[PDB]
């Protein structure tokens, strides 16, 4: 259920800004406060004109788009919308650039907190290029917080290069242990699966081609932080206080976090609450895990 | 049928540039009022002072060659040209670089409409680099229009390194079939096949050689364009005013438009003309496909 | 043994550094004064203000570090550390950069006499490309030097991306052959073995998945240099005065050079200390190798 | 037989200097006056001391030495041999720098007519690396001239990484037929075989590793230069006035030209006479080929 304060700042963006809006929908993750957000495919400026509000004017939102009229489109709107959230300056710069190459686009390393994207962004042929440069923007405890489709198979690449199958913008799917992998090599802590949603699949001459595989939308968190230190196991409490989840904090499929609730927790999780931004909303102490996408969407 | 306006430039080029041109002919696609040109392969003019005169005033031609002689002859030429044409200005640059490296040639992303190219372009060993290149450059909605050599079979590495076969300037043909793959991997939209003529051995060693193999020349155009939104099927109605093609206007050979009819298309062409300069020429209402260049040379 | 004057470098760090200290323990090499240092890794601070002590006001020590807050931490102790050793400025400096890149940190070529890391350093994916920086920072005659996990067999990439084995830190081992093919193509004279340790794995899972591989903590001295013209075998005399090991000179596994005893050594050991550092220490004159690090820490 | 004005050049170098040489002998082309060359490996300086006298004022020498040292020993002598010379300035830069970096070390690109090594150079890991930036800074028409080692057989990896076959600088050494395989992809015309002798191995081990396979050292002629018409077989004369090789000029292992004498030849090697600087050197008209080292060694 869509969060007041999210449903809000939706309808107080332009309606022309809303009007032109291709998507998915908004995926956007938890405590948004005074946070710098990379939106990789800003398009014409919604999503980033949201953001604007979630994140106030002490947060930046930088959007970057490969379409220059799209860019332009967007920053026609941003005194409307600047005006409109009683802002005394900009919080919101949009780039005309290729999210393969944020360095180009003049994003400085360790600048951004959060990243998120727009559906279309998963219909790049390279995603671990996308995922090296969202690692190298993104601060210390920051998330890569996304939506994209995986497969249940390794699919050959001669069904990867299939006119079919990049038709119904399944091209560039990962098969989905594939993830795992890229964050290990990359940098990233182990991706966290929030969602799934098994995909199913109206085409014939497709439900010939990829035979038994299936096709999942899933959610992931992918945070960036370093050792400095041994970690334990340790136990934490949510002190209740996230704009739309004070009552509980559904961090992942493994883990929501009611109020006041005491839960123990595993070392990388432990490392992951307190390297981030969250750590300001749980008191951590010292001292059935589901990872498959299908498997998840398989129980709702 | 060479359309008059191109027979005229043509015969308006200084003799002596004229007469230094290595080439199989003006490879050229339609509408080239205002637009940013960019020629690969310059050599000593001849190209870059016709499209001087299709494009005007308004309009800009750059020419790239790799050999620096080249590229002093055909400034030597600038003035003469500009002085005939009655421009008030040059609007045609010459560079010395390589065009594999168009980036350290200067050449700006997203700063020409169209990318046409001399036949010599076609001996790179490296065409997938060439398209990158291209794909930078171009504006959206822009085309690479260009002949190549195509292969009716995937010819082993020992056959395409054969020094018979670099011997007839088949080195660097790609398998047809390939064509698509490096558009669908660098951004361009599907290849749009315009014509096909296969090309006849008459080297007995490379009868030996090649085999069954069989050759093609043959002519795509490659539009760059992003995915703002829904497209549906739409039609399109050509309004007939494109210089030299009032009467009709062959797209490519699946499409020819004849003047005021009623064409239904497909969303990808009518994202294409959507987004392209042939806008302007077009009425277009929201409402046997060959791409083999062997058939298609075949049933001539 | 740790030599006293490291002994006491270590005591001179401010508590508060030392106290915020992850690794395996000091992998440092000897001769130090004077020399320009690069510490892969610095971390909060410790090893360099150990090192900014070994090397002297002459000297210079860089720490390089992937964490901002690291970096941060550490120099806030900079003038601390200058004012307790009594030196006119400070001879370290801390970046924030990625060891993998250390153009983009700033550091230039042939700048840095040695390089040394923490052992988190043995946790990259890229091997590789860390010893390509090392060699393009490093010096003439300078050496990387450095302890890090080698595996007994050439593991498959189906168990090196194995969460098991990287959840032990055993995540990016090299088979152990590999280190001298690296050096080899990158410019480097063959490794140098120091020292090695097997580990022990405690795991109960990880002992079914790697099989009959074994796993050792070894020591290397790579070296860079070039050669400027034929080299003889030579003999070397250790004139016994490198602070800490005056006695002897325990080089590598196949050569301690114990003080005024002429030890005949091949081309390259002769090449290696003729360009090094180590030339101010021996007099040279023109006149059963373990390279293996399982066998060396089996005996 | 070494030409008398190499001989004295030799001479003529500071003794010191001519001291500290390691290599294999001076590997040196013909008509050096006036030009650019490049000295890949310079060393304490030697070689770039003889060049200098041999292209005289008009000419540069640049050397490129990976070991500071070197290139501040060879740097000592610089006005030394200006004197001696009686240079009005000095026409010889030394550059510490790595020869696979030639872009780094501040060489612009179609800056040298000629690029020659020192032996040492044959002991790269990357020899198609040194063969770009060769081509890279050769000017229209100019050649890169070298000796190294080459095998009869393609090693496998495994003995190519051994540390025997490293042990007598046979490392790195490609398989003949590569050469020509790595000119044709980065753009040199093929090879000019000129000279080949036979390598003997006098280590017992060696001889077990390497089985039948043999190794020549032998000295090749790249050209570079581009294809701005169509060329004819051609007649050429030697009018027998390069420096040294006044009666004639034995270009490579096909062609000795002998002054005066008329000579039909092939397309190519008319293109590299026509397009280099030996072209001066012969009047040219429109009017049992060795490339196999180990057959060229074999024969004498």
Not at 152 to 166: D, F, N, Y
């Amino acid at each position: 259920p869509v969060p007041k304060h999210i449903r809000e700042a939706l309808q107080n963006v332009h309606e022309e800004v809303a009007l032109r809006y291709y998507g998915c929908g908004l995926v956007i993750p938890e405590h948004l406060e005074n946070c710098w957000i990379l939106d990789l495919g800003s398009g014409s400026g919604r999503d980033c004109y949201v953001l604007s509000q979630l994140v106030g004017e002490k947060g930046h939102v930088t959007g970057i788009d490969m379409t220059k009229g799209q860019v332009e489109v967007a920053e026609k709107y941003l005194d409307y919308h600047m005006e409109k959230y009683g802002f005394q300056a900009s919080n919101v710069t949009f780039i005309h650039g290729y999210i393969e190459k944020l360095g180009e686009a003049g994003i400085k390393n360790e600048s951004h907190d959060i990243v998120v994207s727009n559906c279309v962004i998963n219909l790049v042929p390279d995603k671990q290029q996308v995922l090296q440069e969202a690692y190298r923007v993104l601060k210390h405890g920051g998330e890569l917080y996304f939506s994209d489709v995986y497969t249940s198979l390794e699919l050959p690449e001669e069904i990867r290069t299939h006119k079919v199958l990049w038709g119904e913008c399944l091209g560039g799917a990962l098969y989905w242990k594939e993830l795992a992998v890229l964050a290990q090599k990359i940098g990233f802590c182990p991706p966290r699966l929030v969602t799934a949603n098994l995909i199913t699949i109206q085409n014939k001459e497709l439900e010939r081609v990829i035979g038994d595989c299936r096709f999942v939308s899933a959610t992931f968190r992918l945070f960036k932080h370093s050792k400095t230190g041994p970690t334990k196991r340790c136990q934490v409490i949510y002190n209740g206080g996230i704009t739309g989840h004070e009552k509980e904090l559904m961090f992942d499929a493994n883990f929501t976090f009611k109020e006041g609730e005491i839960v123990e927790v595993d070392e990388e999780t432990a490392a992951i609450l307190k390297n981030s931004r969250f750590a300001q909303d749980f008191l951590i102490r010292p001292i059935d895990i589901i990872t498959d996408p299908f498997k998840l969407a398989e129980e709702s």
